[PDB]
Amino acid sequence: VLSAEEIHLIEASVEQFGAPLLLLDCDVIRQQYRALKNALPNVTLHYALKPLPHPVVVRTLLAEGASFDLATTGEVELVASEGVPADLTIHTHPIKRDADIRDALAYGCNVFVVDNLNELEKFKAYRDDVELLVRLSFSKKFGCSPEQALVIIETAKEWNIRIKGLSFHVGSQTTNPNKYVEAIHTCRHVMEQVVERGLPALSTLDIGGGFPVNYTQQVMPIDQFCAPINEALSLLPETVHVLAEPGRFICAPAVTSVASVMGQAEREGQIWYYLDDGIYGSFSGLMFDDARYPLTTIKQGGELIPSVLSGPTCDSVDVIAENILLPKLNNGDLVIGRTMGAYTSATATDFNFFKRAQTIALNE
Amino acid sequence: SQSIFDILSAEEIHLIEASVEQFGAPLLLLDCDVIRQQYRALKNALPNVTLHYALKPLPHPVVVRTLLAEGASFDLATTGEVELVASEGVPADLTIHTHPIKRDADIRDALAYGCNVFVVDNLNELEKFKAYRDDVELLVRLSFKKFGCSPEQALVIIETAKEWNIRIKGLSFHVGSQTTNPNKYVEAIHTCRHVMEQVVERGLPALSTLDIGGGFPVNYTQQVMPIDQFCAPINEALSLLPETVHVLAEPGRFICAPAVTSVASVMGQAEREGQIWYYLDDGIYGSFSGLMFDDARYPLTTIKQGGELIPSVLSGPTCDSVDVIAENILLPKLNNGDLVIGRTMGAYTSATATDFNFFKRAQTIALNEF
Numbered sequence: 001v002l003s004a005e006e007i008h009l010i011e012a013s014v015e016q017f018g019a020p021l022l023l024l025d026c027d028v029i030r031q032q033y034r035a036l037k038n039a040l041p042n043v044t045l046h047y048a049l050k051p052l053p054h055p056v057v058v059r060t061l062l063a064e065g066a067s068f069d070l071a072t073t074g075e076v077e078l079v080a081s082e083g084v085p086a087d088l089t090i091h092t093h094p095i096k097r098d099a100d101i102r103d104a105l106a107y108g109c110n111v112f113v114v115d116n117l118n119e120l121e122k123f124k125a126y127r128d129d130v131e132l133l134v135r136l137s138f139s140k141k142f143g144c145s146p147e148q149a150l151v152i153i154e155t156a157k158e159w160n161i162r163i164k165g166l167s168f169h170v171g172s173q174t175t176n177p178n179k180y181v182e183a184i185h186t187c188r189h190v191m192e193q194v195v196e197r198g199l200p201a202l203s204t205l206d207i208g209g210g211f212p213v214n215y216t217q218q219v220m221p222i223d224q225f226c227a228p229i230n231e232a233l234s235l236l237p238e239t240v241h242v243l244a245e246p247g248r249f250i251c252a253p254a255v256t257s258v259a260s261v262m263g264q265a266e267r268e269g270q271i272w273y274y275l276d277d278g279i280y281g282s283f284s285g286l287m288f289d290d291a292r293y294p295l296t297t298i299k300q301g302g303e304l305i306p307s308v309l310s311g312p313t314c315d316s317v318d319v320i321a322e323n324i325l326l327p328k329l330n331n332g333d334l335v336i337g338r339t340m341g342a343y344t345s346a347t348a349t350d351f352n353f354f355k356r357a358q359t360i361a362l363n364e
Numbered sequence: 365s366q367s368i369f370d371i372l373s374a375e376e377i378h379l380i381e382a383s384v385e386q387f388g389a390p391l392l393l394l395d396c397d398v399i400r401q402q403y404r405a406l407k408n409a410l411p412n413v414t415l416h417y418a419l420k421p422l423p424h425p426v427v428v429r430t431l432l433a434e435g436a437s438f439d440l441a442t443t444g445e446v447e448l449v450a451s452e453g454v455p456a457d458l459t460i461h462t463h464p465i466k467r468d469a470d471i472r473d474a475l476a477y478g479c480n481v482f483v484v485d486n487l488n489e490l491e492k493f494k495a496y497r498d499d500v501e502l503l504v505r506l507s508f509k510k511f512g513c514s515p516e517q518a519l520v521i522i523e524t525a526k527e528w529n530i531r532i533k534g535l536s537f538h539v540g541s542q543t544t545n546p547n548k549y550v551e552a553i554h555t556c557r558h559v560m561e562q563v564v565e566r567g568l569p570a571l572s573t574l575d576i577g578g579g580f581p582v583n584y585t586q587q588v589m590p591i592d593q594f595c596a597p598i599n600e601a602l603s604l605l606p607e608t609v610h611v612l613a614e615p616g617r618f619i620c621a622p623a624v625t626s627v628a629s630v631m632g633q634a635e636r637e638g639q640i641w642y643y644l645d646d647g648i649y650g651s652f653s654g655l656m657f658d659d660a661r662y663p664l665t666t667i668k669q670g671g672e673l674i675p676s677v678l679s680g681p682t683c684d685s686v687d688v689i690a691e692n693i694l695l696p697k698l699n700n701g702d703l704v705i706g707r708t709m710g711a712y713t714s715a716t717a718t719d720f721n722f723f724k725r726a727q728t729i730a731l732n733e734f
């Protein structure tokens with residue numbers, strides 16, 4: 001269901017800006033940050049720009065006291081253009097060209113990630129400017145083994161590169177908190193091993209993103225989700241500083257998509273609605289994020305008919321919902337997507353030269 | 365994108381390296397000679413079929429001008445495509461607009477440029493053309509998954525167009541992209557033959573046009589039928605039509621795909637679980653987005669091609685584990701900065717690229733326009 005008031009907002013917004021739209025609610029950006037902040041106390045929260053690098057999200061979060069997690073030069077430029085102080089940032093891409101390192105340092109970001117010795121060697125030129133987080137895994141793509149992590153920290157001593165601590169990411173939309181618990185335990189044992197091996201003790205644990213949000217099925221409330229995480233962290237020496245890199249949790253619930261029916265046809269028993277947004281645009285996450293969004297219509301009346309929701313492109317792969325029960329809709333009627341904030345517009349293409357959903361900032 | 369109006373084999377290795385020198389990496393090298401060669405190969409394979417290049421696969425202004433000078437026509441699907449051809453001086457009578465489902469604005473934008481051939485495949489769409497009955501002529505698109513009406517439904521659309529005073533130019537179909545079996549076209553042509561006759565026997569206006577769509581195949585990693593042999597049973601089928609009927613086709617991939625060569629460079633590398641992982645500056649959110657949207661597989665090589673061959677992984681630049689372009693590819697040892705080369709990289713590649721992570725898109729370098 002959508003409230004009468006949510007319906008009014010969506011409808012007003014379409015009058016003024018047209019369709020397709022992404023309604024960004026700054027109050028939910030705030031609501032989500034504070035909830036995570038409350039759920040994970042004494043963890044510094046570095047918003048990952050990646051899922052939604054919108055300048056209004058950045059301004060809204062900066063004003064809340066949030067920090068920031070950067071992966072590229074584009075993202076550095078973004079934070080900089082919004083006057084985010086570089087001491088509030090970390091750079092988390094584990095594989096960087098010399099220029100990527102330079103671009104971030106020039107701005108003032110001096111925390112970086114390594115998970116291999118080839119990348120550690122890139123830092124010999126910059127050893128007086130940086131402190132590194134070593135990313136572990138214990139999915140195939142990034143992170144070194146606990147054992148390799150030691151090799152790297154050791155070599156970083158010989159080379160005089162400062163190691164700030166360890167990081168990991170257990171995966172996006174992690175619905176089981178125990179994964180974090182297991183990872184935190186491991187990182188503790190590695191941190192122990194570093195110390196009585198003669199090496200400089202590690203000051204930081206960066207526990208990543210992956211905190212989950214509600215899509216078509218409901219997930220555990222954040223307080224309950226982070227409870228065993230907090231208990232795991234309490235075993236670390238309270239001289240170890242903890243960060244996180246939330247993306248999805250903050251941005252996902254703050255965006256509602258609005259698409260309109262361009263046209264329609266009966267095909268093999270079903271009504272096909274062809275929307276002005278789809279898999280090459282805001283629903284790109286159906287392809288890249290294996291996503292499934294709650295979909296709704298303003299129109300609720302009459303019988304529900306087996307339906308197909310198709311995207312604007314001529315492509316067959318451009319189908320949003322293969323089989324969905326919907327009221328009979330007219331050309332121009334609206335289709336609403338919830339939890340449309342993360343890995344949606346970010347992963348949009350320009351295929352067919354269809355225009356991208358325009359993002360509207362509300363309660364700014 | 366930018367053009368060079370100026371300046372694997374010995375020669376290809378040289379141009380690749382000097383482009384990387386001049387422009388950086390990743391790059392897409394567009395050869396307008398191959399754009400011409402493919403246009404001409406297809407033109408020869410289908411005598412007397414008017415080829416309307418589908419912009420969708422590679423909506424590149426250089427490709428458009430190159431093709432306009434060759435005598436090609438154009439297949440448009442959107443206002444952005446309309447704007448592209450209009451800015452390159454394409455006359456509006458060389459174009460058709462083949463998107464079956466259109467907002468009123470999509471009709472008016474095409475009409476303002478002067479494109480007056482559109483596609484319909486249902487009566488809801490037909491009805492959007494009442495305001496334009498003096499201006500348009502329509503192709504009725506048949507299917508034999510997402511678009512196209514049945515042969516029976518098409519007759520309804522054609523009878524109703526009459527009652528409403530809307531001209532039907534003809535019939536169209538698209539059998540699917542990368543069709544490897546020409547008999548799909550053949551069967552579709554035979555059916556359109558029948559539908560066109562039924563229209564005459566019902567005493568409706570005779571259809572003037574058959575549009576056989578695109579889908580002509582190219583070589584990726586598996587050899588396809590040479591275009592001449594592929595098109596032979598198609599020509600046979602078309603020769604059974606009244607010599608009155610104008611035949612159109614909407615080639616995209618066949619013309620653009622072989623014309624582009626991708627160049628990526630190794631940003632970094634690690635041995636992970638018995639394989640060397642190379643992280644490239646292009647991947648599935650970039651030029652290799654076809655691996656994802658086009659179910660694609662491209663020939664890949666290296667300029668190195670040298671000594672001991674090691675089981676490797678080619679990963680894109682993004683921190684996403686989905687972004688891997690090849691697993692367990694046997695490559696020689698590469699240093700960072702070394703080049704990984706993709707072939708047949710022209711269609712449904714850069715056109716479906718994203719700005720994810722704000723990673724910079726490959727720059728397209730246009731060679732040999734004039």
Ligand SMILES: Cc1ncc(COP(=O)(O)O)c(/C=N/CCCCCN)c1O
Nearest residue numbers: 048172209210245246247248288289683
């Ligand atoms: C180093 C690092 N830090 C933070 C994030 C944000 O994770 P989320 O909180 O958005 O799940 C990510 C995101 N990782 C993968 C997202 C893949 C999207 C689905 N295709 C990351 O790689």
Ligand SMILES: Cc1ncc(COP(=O)(O)O)c(/C=N/CCCCCN)c1O
Nearest residue numbers: 314418541542578579614615616617658
């Ligand atoms: C009405 C119409 N006409 C022509 C084309 C061009 O087909 P191709 O020759 O590029 O296979 C198309 C292209 N369809 C693209 C679908 C496959 C691309 C990968 N998902 C089309 O929709």
